[PDB]
């Protein structure tokens, strides 16, 4: 009656994410995710190491998507239609309303990079959203008459959760990306005294202990009082809104007159992502944007949205304003290799556009990583607040886990695992 | 321990418990099963009563109460007889039960079994009651109420050891159904289970909202015979969510009831139709009103006005009155009639998992639970699967325990 | 290679081995290791290692620094392997003990780095690249690596353990084309089948499964007759050690007439009787898939595939191994029926189907498992009475049965079947307690059973009047996925039976076309898309809600709306209108104005697809062009030509190229043809028809991103 865990992804890595857990008699999959930076069958997890059996519907019992980030949910239209799987998919309520837009926006990139060899289509994202079964926080739901799950509050994005699995005496809680600092946006994660047999946490900000909120405002202020334009490459949902609410506030409290622009094209959750935001925890200075006035001289702030400077508006806009010493770009996220936004963030100032051209880049370039993960203090705070019998680390770096594993081993006096990519881990009950 | 059983109904019990020196009479609500033998408001609709012929009430010491759905017989027990004991109950219970009692009398003085009571009795009855909270131990044995989660004020009573569970839920807003608090007992009385054991509640909730929105979207009127307190709240928190999610637009919700203002503690809650209602009355509309039995109340007026058109619709949600016999006095009829019984109680798949967690020694339930239902006589899972076998009882019986 | 990348190699090799810079990016190495394969596969490799004598010093440092990273080692092993794949480079890489040093105890094998599964997976995938010629064959035999692979095929990492068993099979088959290597391998396998623990047996049965199937040379035939005695002795223990690996062996052997020509079918026939009620199924279906088989075996195969159903059909009013499972518990009962209906469904569309294929009996057995699931059956025993208590309300068995009952309609049969089939289908729709995933399958079964009937006869029109009152109740369900599922049924039904006087009389008589039109304002965006598509179909058939107040309601969505899903669903409707032919210029002119002003790349791409349809109907010629310039097409096509989305630019490139052709075989045609010739198109087409990373995926820009660090750039969420 032992518990087995197999980090099919995100083991000592922050690329894919997939964790196959086998509680006493049931199999469960957590956070079927993806890996940008590739263009072939390597972007998805390897589910063949599960299909050495009967069909997936026969093997698995449920799938659980913690939040709407793409490294945690971006292989769902593939795993559920091409591989083939008919069964419950337990998200939360905002995650079900944000995933169809993120998966439809990434499909624009793949069809652009000529990478739709084994890939889902727009009809296959719809059919996959119909297998979803939304849940409510703290509201236990019944699976298979013996497998009982239940959500919690995590933070770090609108919709994230921290699921718990129960098959009776055995229990596994899977804390996805979560926060413990009570940020001014969402809040801190809270879990009750359940004491499961395992706790599957993450270790992104392992070796790291509101300076960022100010320094963002100061640098936009310092570049807009000199007749310079800002550019913020960002995805449709996620971080684009937590900045608009930040610029809108700071601007009425200073009575500015510079135009802000924002347009996605696939959605208007600029005033609907807030509708879901109210039950969890209308603009004046933010208008719509078009290609018409991306060249009229004057100070500006733009939120273009093909992502981490992929092909699209952001790349085409940045291509124009690159010849100016006063403009700037702000990369509010982590860019992967193989994209314009990765070279710029590290070194290179002489790119090459189509043809034999060479574009010189004289703008400023900043990097205000606005992610909100836990930290050495917060992780220790949760393991004590949760009181498990063993801790397992995923979704981090190879060494920062090794150091953090010692502290949890020694201080809290409990055995902590650090399984590699594909290593099963058995622990008795 | 000689449990006298005064009523046979499985949902509205009446059980007297004899002890060393104390006597306890739990859950003493009426039986509306008889008020629809008569004709609507040619006689006076008369109510049943627990069989008091088995024992006198001048010997009863205390009277416990779990929830408001079984209290309407409290007048007949503490006023007409020589009862001289105390009565315990819970705060939000008596606040609601008082409201239901005022509605019933208001309906009937407008123009063995006994006639209906008057405002004089209820005030004197609702006076001699001592109110408690959850876990507040009370002395006498040492009885104490717990949380059942069925209704707002709804408590199971554990006497000390003998446990008692009546009308408890597990699908929740109220306080959770605690389970560790009632284990390690000698015997365990378990009454008040669901009456639609097959159909899940969530199916019927989506069945209420779907038949509703199918009519108002076609220019029709929907009449929903319901109580002012009880299941009406769960209908409204689901109807509000439905209107916001499915997109019903601009349909009035007239919750007309004699006692409605204090009943909430765009739903307009007018006090009666004789008044400003006949002026501000826009169709297509929805009217949660009347009394479930259809034998009196405002619904008798609505049931006659709309009953002559195939566009209108009436929907039943009280899983207690057979809608086929409660509707016969109106035939012939043209208005669609739909049965959508929303019932949130302990299902049979739920009650067994309770026993294999609480693990009692002896359990006792009415005859209607130790036998499969009269419809699906073949289904052997729709029955209390317990070991050892449960000591059944019937109307006017004396068990040995 | 090329000069740009070449001059950048020496710096690359220096930074990879240096102990001061941060470790290189794992993604970058994989993208770099894939580059080398491209070069060496099309040219010679020994010429390369001399022309650029810096790679060897990188390989040579691997066994000298003793402090390399965990991931630079893995890169080098796979790089040493991919170079020493041709015989010329395999020997040239030995002057200095390089290859026997890397894959030997001196290298990363004997140190304290054989602990990270990244290096191991690199060691194995290093060998598999070089083991392609006889020189390497002798290298694997003498120094000892087959003895090492035996220890790697037990690893705690499924990624390593399964790649080792894929190397024994590559070494074995290369050894023979008994020789030295082969004789030792077959000995260890044959010694593993006789083990006592399950993992050792599973490791053997997976080396055998890949042998038979990847090589049919007559040396494999000799191997089967030698191992069959021990393989057959596995069906004699209390638990069969590895059942699903055991079964997979019998099927890859059986699907080859060579091996099947006496001891094979005797084991197969004995397996069908001794395997438990979890693997007897997967084996019994594999048999029925084959053309060559003893008829006495198939008759036993089919009869053990129908056994779970035959128990249900007899325990309700109209084998101990099976009757026990269906009653053992709820999990095992729902388990055995879901697998049986899946198997029996993969079987029907086959031409090698068993015969006679029982149609009437299977349907009656499938309909009587939908009622038990629903809850309105009638027992005929104590096992039938126990079945109602288990199957009642089981969504997994109801989904499996509803997919099957949809499959059992492509074989022609009497109409007695259809009446019995629809009767139980319609009961699932007009019922509470059907989940939104069951209603999606009931709506898909009901459609195959209608479109496969023998105007519209005497019985279909009656079922319709019973049906549409159920469709009205579903377009109002409190779930967007049910209101969506019922609008794709009303669309497909109206796409076939749209011109039947009977269907149009049962449709308009109900309230369906009015509910289908109040859903153009549903809050969910997936239901506006389905409602717009249904109205588009329902209006091509002339069944508007009791004709142009729709085009005014649709054109409003295309302009004033939030989401993209309704907008790109509106464009498909307007295109289907124009092509079918349901004042034309004013239509195309109004639509191509809302497309060009839009912000989604799907709405614009369909704009040019709406132009092509309109362009074809137009191409005496002077007005044809004058009309074509009146709608504003040329304003649209030229703006999209230089656009921020490469998929949108191709559609406009293909458009003008099609326009520059027709305008040749026949403002003014002369002047506009200049504006068409003045700009280049073939050069544009060749640029647009390539990936959007032809600069950032190049080996030049890949190399620079690895040796030009030193900025702010760690790994985080996308
Ligand atoms: Zn995240
Ligand atoms: Zn992540």
User: Do residues B321 and B145 lie in contact, with contact meaning Cβ atoms separated by under 8 Å?
Assistant: no
Quick check: helix, strand or coil at residue C277? coil
Question: Could you identify the residue written with the tokens 């794709």?
Answer: C488
Q: Can you say whether the dihedral through the CA atoms of C377, C382, C383, C388 is positive or negative? A: positive
Angle, helices C480-496/C501-508, rounded to nearest 10 degrees:
150
Nearest residue to A314 (alpha-carbon basis) of C645, C653, C704, C605: C645
Same domain, A215 and A243: yes
Nearest residue to B287 (alpha-carbon basis) of B252, B334, B242, B244: B252
Method: cryo-EM
Q: Chain C contacts of A215, Cβ < 8 Å?
A: none
Most C CBs within 10 A among B196, B206, B343, B377, hence the mutation to make, goes to B206
Supply the range of the domain harboring residue A241: 211-366
Report in angstroms the alpha-carbon separations of B341 from B201, B226, C380: 8, 11, 30
**What are the structure tokens assigned to A99, written together?**
């995933």
Report in angstroms the alpha-carbon separations of C46 from C43, C88, C92, C182, C699: 10, 6, 7, 30, 21
C486 to chain A nearest CA, in Å?
A: 13
What subunits touch chain C, counting only 3 or more CB pairs under 8 A?
A, B
Burial class (CB in 10 A: 0-12, 13-18, 19+), C280: buried
Looking at A340, A366, A392, which one is the last position of a domain? A366
Positions of A marked catalytic:
202
* Rg of chain B on CA atoms, in Å: 21
Query: Could you give the CA distance from residue C182 to residue C172 in angstroms, rounded to a whole number?
Result: 5
Quick check: helix, strand or coil at residue C284? helix
DSSP E strands, C522-657:
none
The fold of the B201-339 domain, in CATH, is Rossmann fold (3.40.50)
Burial class (CB in 10 A: 0-12, 13-18, 19+), B111: exposed
Residues of C engaging B, defined by a Cβ cutoff of 8 Å: 375, 378-379, 385-386, 388-389, 392-393, 432-434, 472-473, 476-480, 483, 511, 514-515, 518, 521-523
Query: Could you give the CA distance from residue A251 to residue B292 in angstroms, rounded to a whole number?
Result: 59
The domain that contains A80 carries what CATH number? 3.60.15.10
The domain that contains A314 carries what CATH number? 3.40.50.10890
The ligand that comes nearest to the alpha carbon of residue A31 is 2
Nearest residue to C397 (alpha-carbon basis) of C417, C381, C377: C377
The residues, ordered by sequence, that sit 6+ positions from A102 with a Cβ below 8 Å of its Cβ are A68, A70, A73, A74, A235, A236, A237, A238
Query: Could you give the CA distance from residue C127 to residue C136 in angstroms, rounded to a whole number?
Result: 9
**What are the structure tokens assigned to A428, written together?**
């008795």
Same domain, A121 and A247: no
Nearest residue to B159 (alpha-carbon basis) of B70, B64, B94, B77: B64
Secondary element (H or E) of residue C147: helix C146-152
Secondary element (H or E) of residue C211: helix C198-214
Q: Work out the number of other CB atoms within 10 angstroms of the CB of residue B397.
A: 14
Angle, helices C180-193/C158-175, rounded to nearest 10 degrees:
130
Most B CBs within 10 A among C317, C476, C519, hence the mutation to make, goes to C476
- The CB-side HSE value for B164 (13 A sphere, CA atoms) comes to 24
Q: Can you say whether the dihedral through the CA atoms of B355, B361, B366, B368 is positive or negative? A: positive
Q: Chain B contacts of C392, Cβ < 8 Å?
A: 198, 379, 381
Same domain, A29 and A119: yes
User: Do residues B314 and B250 lie in contact, with contact meaning Cβ atoms separated by under 8 Å?
Assistant: no
Quick check: helix, strand or coil at residue C60? helix
What is the side-by-side order of every strand in the sheet holding B23-26? B130-132, B86-90, B62-63, B23-26, B14-18, B2-7, B397-398
Query: Could you give the CA distance from residue C535 to residue C487 in angstroms, rounded to a whole number?
Result: 10
User: Do residues C546 and C510 lie in contact, with contact meaning Cβ atoms separated by under 8 Å?
Assistant: no
Residues listed for chain A: 429
Most B CBs within 10 A among C478, C482, C525, hence the mutation to make, goes to C478
Q: Chain C contacts of A70, Cβ < 8 Å?
A: 717-718
What is the side-by-side order of every strand in the sheet holding A171-175? A141-143, A147-150, A162-166, A171-175, A198-202, A391-394, A416-417
Query: Could you give the CA distance from residue B23 to residue B85 in angstroms, rounded to a whole number?
Result: 10
B400 to chain C nearest CA, in Å?
A: 33
* Rg of chain C on CA atoms, in Å: 34
B222 to chain C nearest CA, in Å?
A: 15
Angle, helices C330-346/C295-305, rounded to nearest 10 degrees:
130
CA C20 to chain CA centroid, nearest Å: 44
Same domain, A53 and A163: yes
Q: Chain C contacts of B213, Cβ < 8 Å?
A: 476
User: Do residues C370 and C332 lie in contact, with contact meaning Cβ atoms separated by under 8 Å?
Assistant: no
Q: Can you say whether the dihedral through the CA atoms of C470, C473, C476, C478 is positive or negative? A: negative
Report in angstroms the alpha-carbon separations of A72 from A75, A136, A160: 8, 20, 11
The residues, ordered by sequence, that sit 6+ positions from A140 with a Cβ below 8 Å of its Cβ are A148, A149, A150
User: Do residues C682 and C654 lie in contact, with contact meaning Cβ atoms separated by under 8 Å?
Assistant: no
Quick check: helix, strand or coil at residue C379? strand
Nearest residue to C225 (alpha-carbon basis) of C203, C258, C193: C258
Question: Could you identify the residue written with the tokens 């026969």?
Answer: A58
Looking at A366, A394, A415, which one is the last position of a domain? A366
What is the side-by-side order of every strand in the sheet holding B286-289? B267-268, B253-254, B286-289, B222-225, B313-316, B336-339
Same domain, A54 and A115: yes
**What are the structure tokens assigned to B106, written together?**
């208001």
Phi, psi values for residue B349, rounded to 5°: -65, -20
**What are the structure tokens assigned to C25, written together?**
């990016």
**What are the structure tokens assigned to C106, written together?**
């001196």
**What are the structure tokens assigned to B238, written together?**
């689901």
Same domain, A227 and A334: yes
The ligand that comes nearest to the alpha carbon of residue A204 is 2
User: Do residues A303 and A234 lie in contact, with contact meaning Cβ atoms separated by under 8 Å?
Assistant: yes
Work out whether strand A27-30 and strand A18-22 pair parallel, antiparallel, or are unpaired. antiparallel
Looking at A343, A366, A389, which one is the last position of a domain? A366
Same domain, A139 and A90: yes
- The CB-side HSE value for B270 (13 A sphere, CA atoms) comes to 19
Same domain, A24 and A167: yes
Same domain, A21 and A166: yes
Long-range contacts of A344-353 (CB under 8 A, 24+ apart): A344/A309, A345/C711, A345/C712, A345/C713, A346/C705, A346/C708, A346/C709, A346/C710, A346/C711, A346/C712, A346/C713, A347/C708, A347/C709, A347/C710, A347/C711, A348/C704, A348/C705, A348/C708, A351/C695, A352/C695, A352/C701, A353/A319, A353/C695
Asked if residue A72 belongs to a known ligand binding site, the reply is yes
Burial class (CB in 10 A: 0-12, 13-18, 19+), B310: exposed
User: Do residues B3 and B18 lie in contact, with contact meaning Cβ atoms separated by under 8 Å?
Assistant: yes
Question: Could you identify the residue written with the tokens 């309303």?
Answer: A97
Q: Can you say whether the dihedral through the CA atoms of B223, B227, B228, B231 is positive or negative? A: negative
For chain A, the straight-line distance linking the first and the last C-alpha, in angstroms and rounded, comes to 7
Q: Which residues of B are annotated as a binding site?
A: 2, 19
What subunits touch chain B, counting only 3 or more CB pairs under 8 A?
C
3-state secondary structure chain B: CEEEEEECCCCCCEEEEECCCCEEEECCCCCHHHCCCCCCCCCCCCECCCCCCCCCCCCCCEECCCCHHHCCCHHHHHCCCCCCCEEEEEHHHHHHHHHHHHHHHHHHCCCCCECCCCHHHHHHHCCCCEEECCCCCCCCCCCEECCCCCCCCCCCEEECCEEEEECCCCCCCCCCCCCHHHCCCCEEEEECCCCCCCCCHHHHHHHHHHHHHHHHCCCCCEEEECCCCCHHHHHHHHHHHHHHHHCCCCCCEECCCCCCHHHCCCEECCCCCCCCCCCCCCCCCEEEECCCCCCCCCHHHHHHHCCCCCCCEEEECCCCCCCCCCCHHHCCCCCEEEECCCCCCCCHHHHHHHHHHHCCCEEECEHHHHCCCCCCCCCCCCCCCCCCCCCCECCCEECCC
The ligand that comes nearest to the alpha carbon of residue A68 is 1
Q: Provide the resolution (angstroms).
A: 3.2
Q: Is the peptide bond before C673 cis (omega within 30 degrees of 0)?
A: no
Query: Could you give the CA distance from residue B277 to residue C507 in angstroms, rounded to a whole number?
Result: 39
3-state secondary structure chain A: CCEEEEEEECCCCCCCCEEEEECCCCEEEECCCCCCCCCCCCCCCCHHHCCCCCCHHHHEEEEECCCCCHHHHCCHHHHCCCCCCCCCEECEHHHHHHHHHHHHHHHHHHCCCCCCCCCCCHHHHHHHHCCECCECCCCCEEECCCEEEECCECCCCCCCCEEEEECCCCEEEEECCCCCCCCCCCCCCECCCCCCCEEEEECCCCCCCCHHHHHHHHHHHHHHCCCCEEECCCCCCCCCHHHHHHHHHHHHCCCCCCCEEECCCCCCCCCCHHHHHCCCCCCCCEECCCHHHCCCCCCEEEECCCCCCCCCHHHHHHHHCCCCCCCEEECCCCCCCCCHHHHHHCCCCECCCCCCCCCECCCEEECCCCCCCCCHHHHHHHHHHHCCCCEEEECCCHHHHHHHHHHHHHCCCCCEECCCCCECEEECC
User: Do residues A331 and A318 lie in contact, with contact meaning Cβ atoms separated by under 8 Å?
Assistant: no
Query: Could you give the CA distance from residue B98 to residue B311 in angstroms, rounded to a whole number?
Result: 37
Query: Could you give the CA distance from residue B96 to residue B228 in angstroms, rounded to a whole number?
Result: 9
Work out whether strand A27-30 and strand A60-64 pair parallel, antiparallel, or are unpaired. parallel
Quick check: helix, strand or coil at residue C704? helix
Question: Could you identify the residue written with the tokens 């044959």?
Answer: C190
User: Do residues B224 and B286 lie in contact, with contact meaning Cβ atoms separated by under 8 Å?
Assistant: yes
User: Do residues C478 and B209 lie in contact, with contact meaning Cβ atoms separated by under 8 Å?
Assistant: yes
Q: What is the DSSP letter of C487?
A: H
Burial class (CB in 10 A: 0-12, 13-18, 19+), C331: middle
Query: Could you give the CA distance from residue A339 to residue C134 in angstroms, rounded to a whole number?
Result: 43
Long-range contacts of C665-669 (CB under 8 A, 24+ apart): C666/C619, C666/C621, C667/C625, C667/C629, C668/C622, C669/C621, C669/C622, C669/C625
For chain B, the straight-line distance linking the first and the last C-alpha, in angstroms and rounded, comes to 6
Q: What is the DSSP letter of C107?
A: I
Cα C361–Cα C364–Cα C368 angle in degrees, nearest 5: 140
Same domain, A100 and A175: yes
Same domain, A329 and A382: no
Cα A396–Cα A397–Cα A398 angle in degrees, nearest 5: 130
Same domain, A45 and A132: yes
Query: Could you give the CA distance from residue C168 to residue C146 in angstroms, rounded to a whole number?
Result: 8
* Helices first, then strands: H and E counts in chain C: 43, 0
**What are the structure tokens assigned to C588, written together?**
């195309």
Q: Which residues of B are annotated as a binding site for 1D-myo-inositol hexakisphosphate?
A: 2, 19
- Nearest by CB to A313, from C399, C484, C644: name it: C644
Query: Could you give the CA distance from residue C360 to residue C358 in angstroms, rounded to a whole number?
Result: 6
Nearest residue to C139 (alpha-carbon basis) of C110, C98, C79, C111: C98
C329 touches chain A (CB under 8 A): no
Phi, psi values for residue B201, rounded to 5°: -65, -45
C690 touches chain A (CB under 8 A): yes
Query: Could you give the CA distance from residue A237 to residue A272 in angstroms, rounded to a whole number?
Result: 11
Q: What is the DSSP letter of C497?
A: S
Breaks (C-N over 2.5 A) in chain C follow: 177, 261, 318, 454, 546, 582, 619, 666, 713
- The CB-side HSE value for C1 (13 A sphere, CA atoms) comes to 19
Q: How many independent structural domains does chain A possess?
A: 2
């Amino acid at each position: 009656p032992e518990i087995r865990v197999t980090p099919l992804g995100a083991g000592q890595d922050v690329g894919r994410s997939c964790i196959l857990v086998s509680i006493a008699g049931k199999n469960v999959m957590l956070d079927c995710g993806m890996h940008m930076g590739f263009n072939d069958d390597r972007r998805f997890p390897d589910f063949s190491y599960i299909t050495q059996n009967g069909r997936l519907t026969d093997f698995l019992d449920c799938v659980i998507i913690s939040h709407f980030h793409l490294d945690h949910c971006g292989a769902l239209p593939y795993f559920s239609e091409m591989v083939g799987y008919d069964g419950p998919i337990y998200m939360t309520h905002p995650t079900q309303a944000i995933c169809p837009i993120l998966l439809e926006d990434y499909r624009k990139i793949a069809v652009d990079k000529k990478g739709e060899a084994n890939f889902f289509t727009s009809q296959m994202i719809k059919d996959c959203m119909k297998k979803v079964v939304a849940v409510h926080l703290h509201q236990t739901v019944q699976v298979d008459d013996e497998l009982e799950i239940k959500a919690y509050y995590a933070g770090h994005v609108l919709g994230a959760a921290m699921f718990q699995i129960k098959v009776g005496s055995e229990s596994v809680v899977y804390t996805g990306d979560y926060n413990m600092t009570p940020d001014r946006h969402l809040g801190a994660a809270w879990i009750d005294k359940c004491r499961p047999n395992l706790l599957i946490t993450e270790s992104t900000y392992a070796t790291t202990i509101r300076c960022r909120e100010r320094d963002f405002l100061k640098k936009v202020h310092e570049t807009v009082e000199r007749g310079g334009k800002v550019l913020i490459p960002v995805f449709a949902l996620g971080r684009a809104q937590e900045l608009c609410i930040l610029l809108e506030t700071f601007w009425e409290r200073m009575n500015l007159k510079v135009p802000i622009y924002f347009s996605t094209g696939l959605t208007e959750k600029a005033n609907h992502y807030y509708k879901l935001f109210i039950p969890w925890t209308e603009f004046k200075h933010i208008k719509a944007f078009d290609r018409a006035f991306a060249d009229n001289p004057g100070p500006m702030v733009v939120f273009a949205t093909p992502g981490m400077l992929h092909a699209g508006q952001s790349l085409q806009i940045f291509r124009k304003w690159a010849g100016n010493e006063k403009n700037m770009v702000i990369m509010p996220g982590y860019c992967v290799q193989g994209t314009v936004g990765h070279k710029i963030l590290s070194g290179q100032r002489k790119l090459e556009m189509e043809g034999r051209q060479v574009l010189e880049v004289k703008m400023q370039v900043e990097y205000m990583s606005f992610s909100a993960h836990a930290d050495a203090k917060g992780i220790m705070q949760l393991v004590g607040q949760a009181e498990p019998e063993s801790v397992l680390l995923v979704h981090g770096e190879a060494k920062k886990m090794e150091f953090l594993k010692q502290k949890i081993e020694q201080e809290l006096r409990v055995n902590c695992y650090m399984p590699a990519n594909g290593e099963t881990v058995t622990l008795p009950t | 321990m000689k449990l006298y059983c005064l009523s046979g109904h499985p949902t509205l019990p009446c059980n007297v418990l004899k002890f060393k020196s104390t006597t306890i009479m739990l859950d003493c609500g009426l039986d509306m099963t008889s008020t629809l033998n008569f004709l609507p408001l040619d006689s006076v609709p008369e109510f049943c009563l627990p069989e008091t012929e088995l024992i006198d009430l001048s010997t009863v010491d205390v009277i416990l109460i779990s929830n408001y759905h079984c209290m309407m017989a409290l007048p007949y027990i503490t006023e007409h007889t020589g009862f001289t004991g105390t009565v315990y109950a819970t705060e939000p219970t008596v606040q609601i039960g008082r409201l239901l009692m005022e509605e019933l009398v208001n309906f009937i003085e407008r123009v063995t079994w006994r006639r209906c009571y008057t405002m004089q009795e209820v005030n004197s009855a609702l006076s001699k009651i001592q109110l408690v909270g959850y876990s507040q131990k009370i002395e006498l044995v040492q009885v104490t109420p717990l949380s059942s989660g069925y209704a707002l004020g709804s408590s199971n009573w554990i006497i000390q050891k003998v446990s008692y569970v009546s009308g408890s839920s597990l699908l929740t807003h109220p306080q959770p159904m605690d389970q560790a608090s009632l284990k390690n007992s000698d015997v365990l009385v378990l009454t008040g289970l669901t009456q639609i054991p097959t159909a899940n509640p969530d199916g019927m909730v989506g069945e209420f909202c779907s038949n509703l929105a199918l009519t108002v979207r076609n220019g029709g009127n929907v009449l929903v015979p319901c109580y002012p307190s009880g299941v009406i709240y769960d209908l409204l928190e689901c109807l509000y969510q439905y209107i916001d999610s499915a997109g019903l637009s601009s349909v009035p919700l007239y919750f007309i009831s004699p006692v409605a203002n204090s009943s909430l503690e765009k739903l307009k809650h007018y006090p009666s139709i004789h008044g400003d209602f006949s002026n501000d009355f826009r169709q297509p509309c929805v009217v949660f009103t009347g009394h479930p039995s259809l034998r009196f109340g405002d619904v008798v007026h609505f049931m006659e006005l709309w009953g002559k058109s195939s566009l209108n619709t009436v929907i039943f949600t009280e899983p207690d009155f057979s809608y086929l016999e409660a509707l016969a006095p109106y035939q012939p009829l043209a208005m669609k009639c739909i049965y959508c019984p929303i019932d949130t109680r302990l299902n049979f798949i739920q009650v067994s998992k309770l026993l294999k967690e609480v693990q009692p020694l002896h359990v006792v339930c009415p005859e209607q639970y130790t036998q499969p239902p009269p419809a699906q006589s073949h289904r052997m899972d729709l029955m209390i699967d317990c070991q050892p076998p449960a000591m059944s009882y019937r109307r006017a019986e004396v068990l040995a325990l | 290679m090329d000069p740009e990348c070449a001059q950048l190699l020496p710096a690359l090799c220096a930074v990879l081995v240096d102990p001061r810079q941060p470790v290189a990016d794992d993604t970058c190495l994989e993208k770099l290791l894939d580059w080398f394969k491209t070069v060496t596969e099309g040219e010679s490799s020994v010429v390369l290692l001399q022309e650029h004598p810096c790679l060897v010093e990188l390989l040579s440092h691997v066994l000298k620094v003793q402090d390399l990273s965990s991931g630079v080692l893995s890169f080098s092993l796979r790089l040493a392997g991919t170079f020493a794949a041709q015989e010329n480079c395999f020997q040239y890489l030995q002057q200095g003990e390089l290859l026997p040093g890397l894959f030997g105890e001196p290298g990363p094998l004997g140190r304290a780095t054989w602990a990270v599964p990244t290096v191991r997976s690199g060691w194995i995938q290093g060998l598999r690249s070089l083991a392609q010629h006889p020189s390497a064959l002798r290298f694997l035999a003498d120094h000892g690596a087959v003895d090492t692979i035996f220890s790697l095929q037990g690893d705690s990492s499924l990624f390593v353990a399964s790649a080792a068993s894929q190397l024994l099979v590559h070494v074995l088959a290369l050894s023979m084309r008994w020789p030295a290597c082969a004789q030792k391998i077959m000995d260890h396998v044959e010694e593993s089948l006789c083990s006592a623990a399950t993992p050792k047996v599973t490791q053997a049965l997976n080396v055998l499964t890949t042998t038979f199937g990847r090589c049919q040379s007559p040396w494999t035939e000799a191997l089967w007759v030698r191992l069959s005695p021990r393989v057959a002795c596995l069906l004699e223990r209390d638990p069969i050690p590895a059942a699903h690996s055991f079964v997979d062996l019998l099927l890859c052997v059986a699907r080859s007439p060579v091996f099947s020509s006496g001891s094979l079918w005797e084991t197969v026939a004995r397996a069908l009787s001794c395997l438990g009620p979890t693997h007897m199924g997967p084996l019994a279906l594999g048999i029925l898939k084959l053309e060559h088989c003893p008829q006495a075996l198939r008759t036993q195969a089919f009869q053990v595939l129908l056994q779970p159903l035959a128990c249900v059909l007899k325990a309700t009013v109209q084998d101990a191994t099976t009757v026990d499972t269906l009653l053992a518990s709820k999990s095992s009962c729902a388990g055995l029926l879901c697998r049986t209906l899946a198997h029996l469904e993969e079987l029907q569309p086959l031409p090698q189907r068993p015969s006679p294929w029982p149609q009437a009996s299977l349907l009656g057995a499938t309909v009587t498992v939908l009622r038990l699931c629903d809850g309105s059956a009638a027992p005929a025993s104590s096992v039938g009475g126990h079945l109602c208590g288990t199957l009642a309300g089981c969504v997994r068995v109801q989904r499996a049965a509803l997919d099957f009952l949809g499959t059992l309609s492509q074989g022609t049969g009497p109409q007695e079947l259809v009446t019995q089939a629809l009767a139980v289908l319609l009961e699932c729709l007009e019922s509470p307690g059907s989940s939104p995933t069951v209603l999606k399958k009931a709506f898909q079964a009901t459609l195959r059973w209608l479109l496969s009937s023998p105007d519209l006869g005497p019985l279909i029109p009656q079922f319709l009047r019973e049906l549409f009152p159920v469709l009205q109740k579903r377009l109002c369900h409190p779930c967007w996925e049910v209101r969506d599922s019922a609008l794709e049924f009303l669309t497909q039904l109206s796409r076939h039976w749209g011109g039947q006087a009977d269907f149009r009389c049962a449709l308009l008589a109900s309230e369906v076309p009015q509910l289908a039109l109040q859903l153009l304002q549903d809050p969910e965006s997936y239901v506006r898309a389905s409602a717009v598509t249904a109205m588009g179909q329902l209006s091509s058939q002339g069944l508007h809600a009791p004709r142009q107040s729709l085009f005014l309601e649709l054109l409003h969505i295309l302009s004033v709306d939030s989401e993209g899903f309704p907008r790109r669903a509106v464009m498909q409707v307007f295109t289907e209108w124009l092509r079918d032919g349901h004042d034309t210029e004013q239509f195309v002119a109004t639509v191509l104005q809302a497309a060009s002003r839009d912000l989604d790349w799907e709405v614009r791409a369909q704009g040019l697809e709406l132009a092509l349809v309109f362009l074809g109907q137009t191409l005496p010629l002077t007005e044809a062009l004058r009309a074509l310039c009146h709608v504003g097409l040329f304003d649209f096509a030229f703006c999209a030509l230089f656009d921020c989305d490469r998929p949108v630019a191709q559609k406009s490139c293909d458009l003008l190229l099609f326009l520059r052709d027709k305008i040749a075989s026949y403002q003014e045609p002369e002047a506009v043809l200049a504006m068409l010739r003045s700009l280049d198109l073939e050069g544009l087409r060749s640029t647009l028809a390539e990936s959007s990373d032809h600069v950032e995926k190049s080996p030049q820009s890949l190399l620079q991103d690895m040796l030009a660090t030193g900025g702010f750039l760690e790994a985080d969420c996308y």
